[PDB]
Structures are given as structure tokens and as C-alpha cells.
Design a protein around this ligand. Structure first.
Ligand code: GTP
Ligand code: GTP
Ligand code: MG
Ligand code: MG
Lengths: 173, 31, 32, 176
């Protein structure tokens, strides 16, 4: 079983790679087919940290506006949130500010947040340099990583870092 | 093609989907 | 009320719900 | 490991409100709830019966009657081995529509599917709109078995499903 249950949430524009990032984390695989998420889904993975068993319940939101009411319901319980954009889609990067506003409206003020610039394997269509993602995260005081579900870059690192940071804050209380 | 179903209609199926998912994981573990 | 979701969207969720219900029964089989 | 020797796929069709879900609830749970919750698309329930010393698993698909769900429900006709066509004896229009449901079976189901017409709500004869004689005559005209049922009063619900399943099994045994 486990010692802690961490509820995580993936948010961001439709098509940025939220489901594929989660599929890489839970199944260590990637497929190029786009199957847009209908409302919400979740996956479970249990990890070991500093002697404790951590059950991660990871909620995967649909990015399209028609699912707003469905996805809004999951901000309240969230202990960590991944804000995902697509490095080949500057509009999805600009929309990170809107996703942050939704976190501030509906999530706890102490929620752990991390920005993921996904699809970093697609440099031939890049629209956002990594420095711009780092600066956005810095201004919000949160961590940033460029990830690739396809090339298996920083997906494990992102989730373990978020869980470590949640555990560290919790342990200190 | 065009939109047809309501929020409550999709939601009720999604909530049941979620409940069954969670129940399946409990029984799978019982092993 | 207001139509918001397509036939494909509802069908897909219904099929997953159905699949999970059957899977839950076959794991429950374990009355072992 | 298998908990059955045969698996039969059954299907309930008919107008919204005639009692398809209540008939299945009576069959699979032996209970009745009068609060109408109209089916969203499709659902199914399981009951396993014994015929000729064989375990028969009945997987019973319960369709929504409302026109808005037709596109969802018609995909479940093809695999059906037996189909209950349900009307409400207090609702003449649901009885008239049986001819339309028969046409939908011809279009979407297997040519040799077993069929049975259920006139449901036979516990409420004060509000009865369709005589038993008229129900028998319609079924005779189409060459289909007929019963009047009541999910509320528990009349002929087991009889209907047992009979349909026996008819499916005899044909399977006929082809050995
Ligand atoms: N090259 C490349 N493609 C990716 C990567 N991640 C996701 N994709 C592709 O991008 C498309 C969208 O991926 P999804 O994970 O389904 O997007 P999503 O964010 O879950 O979208 P919604 O569910 O609609 O909110 C799919 O075709 C993926 O195959 C990646 O890291 N590299
Ligand atoms: N008196 C009486 N009422 C019944 C009987 N069976 C069902 N009802 C009532 O009729 C109403 C409709 O029943 P349902 O089983 O939900 O109807 P349905 O055919 O499944 O309708 P849809 O799902 O919309 O297609 C319910 O509120 C029941 O209480 C019966 O045998 N006798
Ligand atoms: Mg998705
Ligand atoms: Mg029903």
C-alpha cells in the first residue's frame, strides 16, 4: 500500500501532450496518434521516496473549453499541478498565464506548481525558446523543465521532482 | 457531428466510469 | 438543456464504462 | 475458470418509459423502484441460469428508447441473439411503435435473431389501453412469441427471459 497519497493534475491547452506525458510516465511508451481526452481521466503510479511509499493519483484534464466545468472540479483537491505547453505552439505558451489564473481562482494557495515545455524533440517547428519558459517560471517562483513524451526527456524527472517537493513541504508540518 | 448531449449527461457517465476504475483497482490489488 | 457534447464523445465514454464493468466482474472472479 | 458454458447476448428495445430497465431490474435484482430514471444510451446487467444442466450466462443489454440515442443503441443490435420488444399496455402509441421497432430489427440485427414481444405493466388494468387480444394478434401476425409482464408485480419476468433463452439454446443445439 502506501504512506502518502498525492493528488496531481495536468492542465494546459488541448494538443500540448498532457496525456502522452502521463502515458510515458505510467507505461513507458509513446504513440503519435491524437486521441483527445473526453473531460478527464486518471492514472495511478506508486513510487518510493526517502523510505516512504507515495501513491500518485494523476488527473489528466481535457484542454478544450467545453470541458471547463468538468475540469474545474479537480483543482480543489490538487496537491501538485503540471502546467504544460507545446514548444512548437507559442499560443499554448501564452495561455499558461490563463491556466495560472484558473489555479489561483480554484486551487489552494500552497499548491505545488511546475511548468513543462513539452515536445522538445520537435525543434524543427519550435516557436518558444527554452529561456522564455525558464523566465516565465522564475517570475512565478516555480520550477520549469522542457520535456518530450516521444524522446523520453524529463518526464520521470518532472514527476519525481514535483512529488519530492510536495513531500518536503508536507514533512515540514 | 454537432453537439447533442448535455453536461449532466456526459458527467454522469464520466463519474460512473471513474467509480468503476477505482473499484477495479481495489479488486486487482486484492491479489 | 444546452447540447454540448457529440455522439462520438458520449459513445466513447459509454464504451469505456461498459468495458470497465465487464473487467470488474472478471477480476471479481477471484472467489478463490 | 469460466463461470458458464454458454454466453447469450440479449437486447431490450422499445419506446422510452415502457419499463425496459424495470423489467431487467426485476430479473437481475428481484426488486422494483418506481422512480423513473431514463437510460443514458445503453447499459447491461448479468444473470446466469441453468438449462439442460448447462450454465447459461445472460448478458442483457438495455437500450435507451429516446430518439436522441438511436445512433448509440443501433450498434448493439448486431451481436444480439435474442431481442425483447417492449411496449406499455397503458400507452397505445408505444404499442403502435412495435411495428417500427420490428423494422429496426430487420435493418440492424441478424436475420435469424430470436424475438419476443412483452406487453409490460399488466398490473395496472384500470389504465389499460391495449387489450391482451390485440397484443396477441400483433405477435401472431409477425410470427413472434408474446407475453404480458409486470416488473412491479413480478409477473412473467422470469418466464420471458427463461423462454427466450430456451429458444436460443434449442437453435444452437439444432446446429450442434
Ligand atoms: N513529437 C512529439 N509529439 C508529441 C509529444 N507529446 C505529445 N505529442 C503528440 O501531440 C498530440 C497531442 O498529444 P496529447 O497528449 O493527446 O494532447 P493533450 O494535451 O492530452 O490534448 P487534450 O486531451 O485534447 O487536452 C498527439 O498526437 C501526440 O502524439 C512529444 O513529446 N513529442
Ligand atoms: N405499474 C407499473 N409501472 C412500471 C412497470 N415497469 C416500469 N414501470 C414504471 O414505468 C416507468 C418507466 O420505467 P423504465 O424501466 O425506467 O422505462 P424504460 O423503458 O427503461 O425507459 P427508457 O430508459 O427511457 O427507454 C418507471 O418509473 C417505472 O416505475 C410495471 O411493470 N408496472
Ligand atoms: Mg489528453
Ligand atoms: Mg431505461
Amino acid at each position: 500500500t502506501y504512506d502518502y497519497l498525492f493528488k496531481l493534475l495536468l492542465i494546459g491547452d488541448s494538443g500540448v501532450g498532457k496525456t502522452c506525458v502521463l502515458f510515458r510516465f505510467s507505461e513507458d511508451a509513446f504513440n503519435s496518434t491524437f486521441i483527445s481526452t473526453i473531460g478527464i481521466d486518471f492514472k495511478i503510479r506508486t513510487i518510493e521516496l526517502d523510505g516512504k511509499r507515495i501513491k500518485l493519483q494523476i488527473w489528466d484534464t481535457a484542454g478544450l473549453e467545453r470541458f471547463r466545468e468538468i475540469t474545474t472540479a479537480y483543482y480543489r483537491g490538487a496537491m501538485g499541478i503540471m502546467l504544460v505547453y507545446d514548444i512548437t505552439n507559442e499560443k499554448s505558451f501564452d495561455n499558461i498565464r490563463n491556466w495560472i489564473r484558473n489555479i489561483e481562482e480554484h486551487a489552494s494557495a500552497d499548491v505545488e506548481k511546475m511548468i513543462l515545455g513539452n515536445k522538445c524533440d520537435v525543434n524543427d517547428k519550435r516557436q518558444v525558446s527554452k529561456e522564455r519558459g525558464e523566465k516565465l517560471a522564475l517570475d512565478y517562483g516555480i520550477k520549469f523543465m522542457e520535456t518530450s513524451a516521444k524522446a523520453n526527456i524529463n518526464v520521470e524527472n518532472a514527476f519525481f521532482t514535483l512529488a519530492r517537493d510536495i513531500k518536503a513541504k508536507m514533512d515540514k508540518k | 457531428n454537432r453537439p447533442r448531449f448535455t453536461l449532466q449527461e456526459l458527467r454522469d457517465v464520466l463519474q460512473e466510469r471513474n467509480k468503476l476504475k477505482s473499484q477495479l483497482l481495489v479488486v486487482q490489488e486484492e491479489l
